[PDB]
Amino acid sequence: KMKGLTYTMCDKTKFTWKRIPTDSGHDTVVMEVAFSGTKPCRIPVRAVAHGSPDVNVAMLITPNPIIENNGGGFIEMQLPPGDNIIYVGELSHQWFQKG
Amino acid sequence: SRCTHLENRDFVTGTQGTTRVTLVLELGGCVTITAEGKPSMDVWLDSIYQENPAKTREYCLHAKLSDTKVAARCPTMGPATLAEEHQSGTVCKRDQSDRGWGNHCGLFGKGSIVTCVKASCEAKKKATGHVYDANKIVYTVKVEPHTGDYVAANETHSGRKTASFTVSSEKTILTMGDYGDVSLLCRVASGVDLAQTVILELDKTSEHLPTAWQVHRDWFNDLALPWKHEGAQNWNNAERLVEFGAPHAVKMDVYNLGDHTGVLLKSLAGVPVAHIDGTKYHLKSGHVTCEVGLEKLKMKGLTYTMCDKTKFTWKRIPTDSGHDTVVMEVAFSGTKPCRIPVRAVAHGSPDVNVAMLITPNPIIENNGGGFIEMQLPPGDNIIYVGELSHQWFQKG
Ligand SMILES: *[C@@H]1O[C@H](CO)[C@@H](O)[C@H](O)[C@H]1NC(C)=O
């Protein structure tokens, strides 16, 4: 079963990193975010090929990423080569993908 | 939407200037009707039935054989005879038996022999036929407004309306609550061939059989068994379940040809069933032709506030219905009646909304309204319900 598909989307303003986007060595990117609302909610995660904001290119490895009353901040994803911007609502981080 | 409960469906589409749509409605089909600026409607033929259709010919499946009586005569004395030959409810055969001296008979030759067996039907071994009357058959047509309410097949939509079409039923108007009126005229002769049709019925209490079968009139009259009409006392053609074994002196051998139920059931394999709800005999296949009047339907809540785009969640995530439509249901968390802000985008082209809704002007009410059905172009799309979104891939 998919957990929390009926949860509220999180407030896009209320994110911070705990751990900035990082290459895992498996072509995936890993990260962790904190969220500051007192809530269980669905994380608004996406990524953009730089200069093309319309097409979301985030292939998540963590499907339907969710923050819970304890736990949930960690996200893993895969991205196309070249410049990308990762977003977690209003958080963003320019990511360059190798090869 | 009743027509999501079925894997047979049709979609009918009128322009803004449409009135009186003409349909064929079939049992186990369902039609969704759409018109620009009108609420969409699910319309279906619910049932075709009659209370107590006229019993025709009964058939007997298994004979109960009794009172085998024999009489025989010596070769000069002409015909042997029994009173049985003239009684009701007997089967008889007349034949020639070899006779001679010691066959306790004067002369060597062939003597007349007659045998008669009393032949009733075995208890509950009847196949009764029934015939429909165009002056007493009821077609039932059902309608529901294609609202944002999802209700399962074991549950009933509160906006569901029913029209009976007897031959004595003219153009009938159903008030779809807040959605205005729909009118129906279904012509009961523009339907099933009731002269060609018999409801064949065996033992109703048979736990491992159909209640009845819908069978052709000529084929039913060609069943090769003993038969009688309602209230008649004795079987015509009782011969059909009795064999006589070749004569031996003063014997001819009466043999009961056994229960023919399995012979019938093999000839009824795959044949359309008919249900029997006590006195009501229902067809399970067949159709009617209707005109549906859309011209007095109203759009509900076009003057409601658009909903707060932030306050949505899924109850049920976007899903393929199998009809090329996508279905979903959303909750909304404002304490309100409001118009749902629904749209969809071809992925990478955010400007053109591609959501062809099947639920026009989708609305959330103080109870009900969250369900949405729509159609989308092939390839990648994003569905939105305000700030909710879901990437949808459309097949073919
Ligand atoms: C329909 O079936 C479901 C599943 O068994 C059940 O939860 C529900 O109460 C049923 N509805 C009605 C009205 O029978």
Q: What gap in Å lies between CA A72 and CA A18, rounded to an integer?
A: 12
- Give me the DSSP letters along B189-221: TSS--TTSEEEEE--TT-TTS-SEEEEEHHHHH
B-chain residue closest to A11, CA distance? B310
Q: Closest Cα to residue B41, out of B176, B185, B177, B187?
A: B176
C-alpha distances out from residue B239 to B61, B69, B101, B120, B323, Å:
13, 16, 33, 11, 56
- Select from A7, A54, A56 the Cβ nearest to the Cβ of B313: A7
For residue A67, list its beta bridge partners. A41
Any alpha helices (H) in chain B, and if so which ranges?
Answer: 217-221, 261-267
- Residue B233, ligand 1, Cβ within 6 A: no
| Amino acid, res. A97 | Q
- Select from A5, A54, A55 the Cβ nearest to the Cβ of B314: A5
Q: What gap in Å lies between CA B1 and CA B154, rounded to an integer?
A: 13
Technique of determination: cryo-EM
| Amino acid, res. B198 | V
Contact A54 B387 (CB under 8 A): no
Contact B317 A56 (CB under 8 A): no
Q: What is the SS3 assignment for A45-66?
A: EEEEECCEEEEECCEECCCCCE
C-alpha distances out from residue B359 to A35, B35, B42, B149, Å:
37, 11, 11, 10
CA distance A18 to chain B (A): 26
Q: What's the resolution in A?
A: 3.0
Q: Torsion-angle region of residue B28: left (phi > 0), alpha (psi -120 to 50) or beta?
A: left
Contact A6 B348 (CB under 8 A): no
Q: Residue B231 class from Cβ within 10 Å (0-12 exposed, 13-18 middle, 19+ buried)?
A: exposed
- Give me the DSSP letters along B264-301: HHHHTTTPPEEEEETTEEEESS-EEEEEEE-TTB--TT
- CA of B152 from ligand 1 middle (Å) equals 8
Q: What gap in Å lies between CA A30 and CA A33, rounded to an integer?
A: 10
Number of inter-chain CB pairs under 8 A, A vs B: 21
Q: Closest Cα to residue B360, out of B42, B148, B44?
A: B148
| Alpha carbon distance, N-terminus to C-terminus of chain A | 35
Q: What gap in Å lies between CA B323 and CA A23, rounded to an integer?
A: 43
Angle at CA B342, nearest 5°, toward A15 and B381? Answer: 75
Closest atom of ligand 1 to B152 CA is 1
E-state strands within chain A? 15-23, 28-35, 41-42, 45-49, 52-56, 59-60, 66-67, 74-78, 82-88, 91-97
Q: Residue B79 class from Cβ within 10 Å (0-12 exposed, 13-18 middle, 19+ buried)?
A: exposed
Q: What gap in Å lies between CA B382 and CA B365, rounded to an integer?
A: 25
Q: If DSSP codes are grouped into helix, strand and coil, which group holds residue B261? A: helix
